[PDB]
Structure formats: C-alpha cells, structure tokens
Amino acid sequence: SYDRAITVFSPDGHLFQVEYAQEAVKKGSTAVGVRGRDIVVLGVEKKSVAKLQDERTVRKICALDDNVCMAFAGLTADARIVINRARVECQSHRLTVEDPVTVEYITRYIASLKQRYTQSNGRRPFGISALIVGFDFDGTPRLYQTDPSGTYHAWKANAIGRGAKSVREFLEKNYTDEAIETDDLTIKLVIKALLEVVQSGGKNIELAVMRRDQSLKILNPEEIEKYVAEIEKEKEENEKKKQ
C-alpha cells in the first residue's frame, strides 16, 4: 500500500493540497442555496447546456436520503464518491440507530470524511464543496456547506464555485425576512442570484427544491422560463418603468 504523506504543512503553516483542492472547487459551476421557512432552494449555475448532452446524466443536484439532499461544486468524479458515501451512511444510521438521519449529522459526516482525506497517507483531498439542504424533521429547515478543508457551517444562503464570491456579495444584499417571505419568492432569490452571474440563456440553469415534508422536486425547464419571465419582466417594472 502507498503510504506517502500527500497533504503536509508548509513553512508558514499552510496545507497546499487543501488550498489546491479549494482551487478546483473555484473552477466549478457556481451553485447557490437559500434557506426559507417552507421550502429551501438550490440552483446549479454554468450548466454548459451543450444540448448534444443529456440533462439527467449530469445534474449537479442530488438527494442523499428522504429528508436530505445536496449540491456541489468542483471535481465531478470526486463528488460522485462523496455523494454515494453519504447515501450509504444514511441507510446505515438507520440500522445502528432506528431513527433517521439528521440535518447536521450527515453534514458532519461528510466534513469528517473530507478532513480525514487531508491527513491520511496515500490520499489526495476531495476537490469539492457542498451545499447540503434539508428540514430538521420535527424542527426548522436547515442549510449547511462544506469545503475540502473538512470545515462546515450553517448558512442562511450561500454560493460556491465559479464567481461564488460575486453571487455571495450579491446574496448578502438581497436576503431579508421580506425578500422571499413565501415559497414563491424564496425560489426567486436563488433564480436572481444565479442569473446575477449566470450566462445568458436560462438554459444554463437547473434549479430545484424540497418541501418541509414532501419529496424532492427537480423543476422542469418550463416552470423555469415562467419564473424566468415573472422576473425577466419584473426586471423591467422597476428597471424599464423607473429608469
């Protein structure tokens, strides 16, 4: 077995292999997430609609359990591995314990997996950040994020990937009790945030959300152009009718 130490500290106290992993995350398709009160939303930017492609076989959005799901940004292959490992842990948390998987628990698990891979011989870290979504059954709806370092925090809303810095600067200036105070408007802020950096076309997005009790729902490109018009023109009822 290969025992080389891949991730090591440097003169000033840095872990380059982690910082490099973090860089791969940066070169990834933007991904934003907003935490509402009745429905949490997530949308995956730069979906490079090559058309000759096939939507289903590449959606940067996935469900882990029946009460949790996630979005990622970074090395595609890595994500797969991490996705299917959390999926497994989800069912195994039910065989050891009887109750289901929590909002945080599963996120912590993923963070622990990533952290480990930054301190084990023979391994490279995972080049992906994750936006984990889900409502705390018998409680509030939560949102969490993870980066290669293995650190994790709960966000009110957030973005990771290409230009996530921008979308983040934006999100920080649009989130309010009022802004998206209803499922109709909640799924909106994301739509705006994504677009606020998302290439022209709308055929570059792939949003979707989960209800505080219902299964998951991957929106159709139809309900897309609609909510992409309810604001495409709403971006004129104050920008073309007051400008």
Binding site: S1, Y2, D3, R4
Partner: protein
C-alpha cells in the same frame, strides 16, 4: 529487511506519451531480429541466435520455446525478461487446461500474457518488460500468429518481423512473400527474410527455428536446419 515501491514507474508525459514503454520498445528494436509467417497450414518462427565466441554452447539455451503441446514462442529484446514471460505463459497455459480440459486457444493465451505485460506498466516499483513476443498456434483448424509488445497490446499477423532491421524485414515480406504459401515454402521465405540483415555466415547454429502446424508445435533440429540453409531442403 525490504519494503517496496508502491508508486508506478511509468507515467504519462505532457506529450501524452508513456516514456518507459517507448524506451522499452527501443530495447526491442535493438534486439536480434525475429520473423513469423502464417502459412495458412502452419506457422513458422525464426530468429538470429547470434552467440559471441564459439565458447558458447548454443544448445544449453533456446529462444524458440514451447508453451503448450500446440503453442510456441520467440522474442526480440531482453533475454531475461523473455524467460520470465515464458514461465508465466506456460503457467497460464496450465491454469486454463486444468479448468477447461481443452488446450488453451492461442488467442486466449496471448490475451492472458498481454495482460501481464500491461500489468508491468502500471504496478508500482517496476519497469515494463523490454521484450516483444511472437506467439504461434494451431487452435481449431486455423493457424495463428500474434505479437504483443511492452505496452501489453497485441496484434495478429499474417507475417512480420521485430528487432534490428524489422523495418526492412517487414517491407521485404510486405512483398517478398504472400498467403497460400505451403509449409516448407513459408520456412524458406522466413530464413531468407532473416538473412536480409543477418550479418555474417548464417549457419545452422547462428539460427533457430520452430514450426507450428495443425499437428503440434516443435523446434527444428540442427539437421533440418543445416538443410533448409543450403537454399532449399
């Protein structure tokens, strides 16, 4: 006390090339030449058994080796690497027979050994085999001739050459002979294509040949060799 290198010694360069494999082939292109001809009723293998001094006992070692009752081999390149692969092919040949009770199909033996050669281009601590083989066999009526090189890739040839002047030795055959050639015929055009580079007095101890007809594989004796040599036999 020994450990082991777990990292691979072969790795893609930016040109996308697998350097060690090319270099392995270079060891091949620099080895004694070998020719193989599929005569549609038996195959022939022959190579240049150039021994330095006369002190060498040409007998004690062979380059044309029998794998099974119906398979055979020759190489071009590093002799010691060959030997390793001969023991592994013979072994692979038995593991097949014990399970199936039928002699191993030539194509199958090639595939298996090729997999090994490929193994040594990815496993840690090792270098690719500096050799290329020419496997010949009579499996189910049709005669077969194959070649697998360092990369672990193989091909089936109607005839070919490897080693020094393999470029010229090929083109020569690329015309100096063709299908329908009967037994003894393919043998002559083979020892000839050999001389098309064989520097020196090509005698019956300067070469070694084996044939594979649909009735087993064998090595020809210095006699049958001294014969074909006189430009006939």
């Amino acid at each position: 006390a020994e450990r082991g290198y777990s990292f691979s010694l072969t790795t893609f360069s930016p040109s996308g090339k697998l350097v060690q494999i090319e270099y392995a082939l270079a060891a091949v292109a620099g080895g004694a030449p070998s020719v193989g001809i599929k005569a549609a009723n038996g195959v022939v293998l022959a190579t240049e058994k150039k021994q330095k001094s006369i002190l060498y006992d040409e007998r004690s070692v062979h380059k044309v080796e029998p794998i099974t009752k119906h398979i055979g081999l020759v190489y071009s390149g590093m002799g010691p690497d060959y030997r390793v692969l001969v023991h592994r092919a013979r072994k692979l040949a038995q593991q097949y027979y014990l399970v199936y009770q039928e002699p191993i199909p030539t194509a199958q033996l090639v595939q298996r050994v090729a997999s090994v050669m490929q193994e040594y281009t990815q496993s840690g601590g090792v270098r690719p085999f500096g050799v290329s083989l020419l496997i010949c066999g009579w499996n189910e009526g049709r005669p077969y001739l194959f070649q697998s090189d360092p990369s672990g890739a193989y091909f089936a040839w109607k005839a070919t050459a490897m080693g020094k002047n393999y470029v010229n030795g090929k083109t020569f055959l690329e015309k100096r002979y063709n299908e329908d050639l009967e037994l003894e015929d393919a043998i002559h055009t083979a020892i000839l294509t050999l001389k098309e580079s064989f520097e020196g007095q090509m005698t019956e101890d300067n070469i070694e040949v084996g044939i594979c007809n649909e009735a087993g594989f064998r090595r020809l004796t210095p006699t049958e060799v001294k014969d074909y040599l006189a430009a006939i036999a």
